[PDB]
Design an enzyme around this catalytic site. Structure first.
Site, PDB file in Angstrom:
ATOM      1  N   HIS A   2     -16.271 -39.071   7.630  1.00  0.00           N
ATOM      2  CA  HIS A   2     -16.111 -39.588   8.993  1.00  0.00           C
ATOM      3  C   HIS A   2     -16.162 -38.162   9.824  1.00  0.00           C
ATOM      4  CE1 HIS A   2     -13.810 -41.688  12.490  1.00  0.00           C
ATOM      5  NE2 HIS A   2     -14.917 -42.024  12.224  1.00  0.00           N
TER       6      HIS A   2
ATOM      7  N   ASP B  69     -20.393 -43.932   6.126  1.00  0.00           N
ATOM      8  CA  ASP B  69     -19.379 -43.520   7.012  1.00  0.00           C
ATOM      9  C   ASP B  69     -18.062 -44.500   6.688  1.00  0.00           C
ATOM     10  OD1 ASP B  69     -19.062 -42.165   9.845  1.00  0.00           O
ATOM     11  OD2 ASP B  69     -18.072 -44.004  10.007  1.00  0.00           O
TER      12      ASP B  69
ATOM     13  N   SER C 271     -18.055 -40.485  16.494  1.00  0.00           N
ATOM     14  CA  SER C 271     -17.563 -41.980  16.398  1.00  0.00           C
ATOM     15  C   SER C 271     -17.791 -42.629  17.633  1.00  0.00           C
ATOM     16  CB  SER C 271     -15.992 -41.934  15.785  1.00  0.00           C
ATOM     17  OG  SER C 271     -15.096 -41.303  17.002  1.00  0.00           O
TER      18      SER C 271
HETATM   19  O1  LIG Z   1     -14.911 -44.999  14.606  1.00  0.00           O
HETATM   20  C1  LIG Z   1     -14.714 -45.575  15.607  1.00  0.00           C
HETATM   21  O2  LIG Z   1     -14.509 -44.888  16.589  1.00  0.00           O
HETATM   22  C2  LIG Z   1     -15.241 -46.958  15.704  1.00  0.00           C
HETATM   23  C3  LIG Z   1     -15.293 -47.804  14.404  1.00  0.00           C
HETATM   24  C4  LIG Z   1     -16.092 -49.018  14.579  1.00  0.00           C
HETATM   25  N1  LIG Z   1     -17.049 -48.558  15.890  1.00  0.00           N
HETATM   26  C5  LIG Z   1     -18.085 -49.151  16.067  1.00  0.00           C
HETATM   27  C6  LIG Z   1     -18.437 -50.440  15.532  1.00  0.00           C
HETATM   28  C7  LIG Z   1     -19.646 -50.983  16.092  1.00  0.00           C
HETATM   29  C8  LIG Z   1     -20.364 -50.414  17.201  1.00  0.00           C
HETATM   30  C9  LIG Z   1     -19.862 -49.483  17.602  1.00  0.00           C
HETATM   31  C10 LIG Z   1     -18.574 -48.926  17.456  1.00  0.00           C
HETATM   32  C11 LIG Z   1     -16.528 -47.188  16.380  1.00  0.00           C
END
Ligand SMILES: O=C(O)[C@@H]1CCN(c2ccccc2)C1
Ligand SMILES: *[C@@H]1O[C@H](CO)[C@@H](O)[C@H](O)[C@H]1NC(C)=O
Length: 358
Positions: free
Chosen positions: A302, A253, A145
């Site tokens: 996830h 996701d 993530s």
């Molecule tokens: O699950 C997670 O940690 C976050 C969820 C959204 N995230 C993200 C979005 C856009 C660009 C980079 C990262 C990371």
């Protein structure tokens, strides 16, 4: 099995100023090193990191870190759980910077928190050299993530660090798990308030200024001043990287659906939502067409690589541990019965029967 080591350089800190650290379990017979970047979302403004400091302080402070951690999934030393790299040196870097591993700042009399995620990585690498990393043959920087995106942001920075330090022989590689996001339109619009509902585009735009985050060099030079937020998105930053990077990404996701304001929980899925979800899976598959080493099952899930049952999912008859092994051979063109590009084509969550059930 993994023992905590708080960073000797006391100025490389978590959000609250407490020292950052890493968990380590050495394997003196092996020349391979796995440095895992933990995930855990982020916080892109002051009066929202404070909420994170109230109920997720372990992701902002090392005060209450356990002295010991269990290695799971790709961080496990048992062949049954990790058929890929069970004999490797294991490193788990806790996520306590809330900056998608991009920060290189420092807490002062004008900033409530410190965002040093990128400096945490290089300092851990710096202190690991004196503990066996100097003899390493392969340094695989992995993460899930937010840590998976942290891999894309830092894998070239680690390679150049080992080169400037005088270690051209260490092959630095990347394994980005569930950090390959799309800056797409939300299914239903929300204002950017709170971490989990804010749109992915606006989250990073707010965050990168707030953390003063850094991005890989060539990607910064493409989008230039004011537009470095683009480099947090895998399909944009990956073509600029020079280190070999394996990409692992569920086609659907849960965090991507969350920031898109999608909640698959109740029976009626109207045709509007069906179209959105199918197009989302199509778009994600398209961004991976030119990623030669990738593993993208059509599942609503996830993260994978540090889950104990990560060996169960299959794409086209090949598991991720095998795909990761064939990737190793490719770096020792296509191999004889050892595929590395494994992207599902069926268009709906769980159309792959090997998807995790819960
Ligand atoms: O699950 C997670 O940690 C976050 C969820 C959204 N995230 C993200 C979005 C856009 C660009 C980079 C990262 C990371
Ligand atoms: C400790 O890390 C900080 C943060 O980058 C750096 O400025 C400082 O030079 C480091 N000190 C030592 C002794 O390595």
């Amino acid at each position: 099995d993994l023992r905590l080591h708080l960073l000797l350089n006391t100025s490389v800190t978590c959000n609250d100023g407490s020292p950052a650290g890493y968990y380590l379990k050495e394997s003196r017979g092996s020349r391979r090193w796995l440095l895992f970047l933990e995930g855990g979302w982020y916080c892109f403004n002051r009066e929202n990191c404070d909420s994170r400091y109230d109920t997720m302080r372990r992701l902002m402070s090392s005060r209450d870190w356990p002295r010991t951690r269990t290695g799971t999934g790709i961080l496990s030393s048992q062949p049954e759980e990790n058929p890929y790299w069970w004999n490797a040196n294991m490193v788990f870097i806790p996520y306590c910077s809330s900056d998608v591993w991009s920060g290189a700042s420092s807490k002062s009399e004008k900033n409530e928190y410190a965002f040093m995620g990128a400096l945490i990585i290089q300092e851990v690498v710096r202190e690991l050299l004196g503990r066996g990393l100097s003899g390493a043959k392969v340094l695989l920087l992995a993460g899930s993530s937010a840590g998976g995106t942290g891999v894309l942001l830092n894998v070239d920075r680690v390679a150049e660090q080992l080169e400037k330090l005088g270690y051209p022989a260490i092959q630095v590689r990347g394994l980005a798990d569930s950090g390959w996001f799309l800056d797409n339109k939300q299914y239903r619009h929300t204002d950017c308030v709170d971490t989990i509902t804010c749109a992915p585009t606006e989250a990073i735009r707010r965050g990168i200024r707030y953390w003063n985050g850094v991005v890989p060099e060539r990607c910064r030079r493409q989008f230039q001043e004011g537009e470095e937020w683009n480099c947090f998105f895998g399909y944009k930053v990956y073509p600029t990287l020079r280190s070999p990077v394996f990409v692992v990404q569920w086609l659907f996701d849960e965090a991507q659906l969350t920031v898109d304001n999608v909640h698959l929980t109740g029976q009626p899925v109207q045709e509007g939502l069906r179209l959105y979800i199918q197009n989302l899976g199509r778009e994600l598959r398209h961004t991976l067409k030119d990623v030669p080493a990738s593993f993208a099952p059509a599942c609503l899930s996830h993260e994978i690589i540090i889950r104990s049952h990560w060996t169960d999912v299959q794409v086209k008859g090949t598991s991720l541990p095998r795909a990761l092994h064939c990737w190793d051979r490719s770096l020792h063109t296509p191999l004889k019965g050892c595929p590395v590009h494994l992207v599902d084509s069926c268009p709906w969550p769980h159309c792959n029967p090997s998807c995790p059930t819960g």
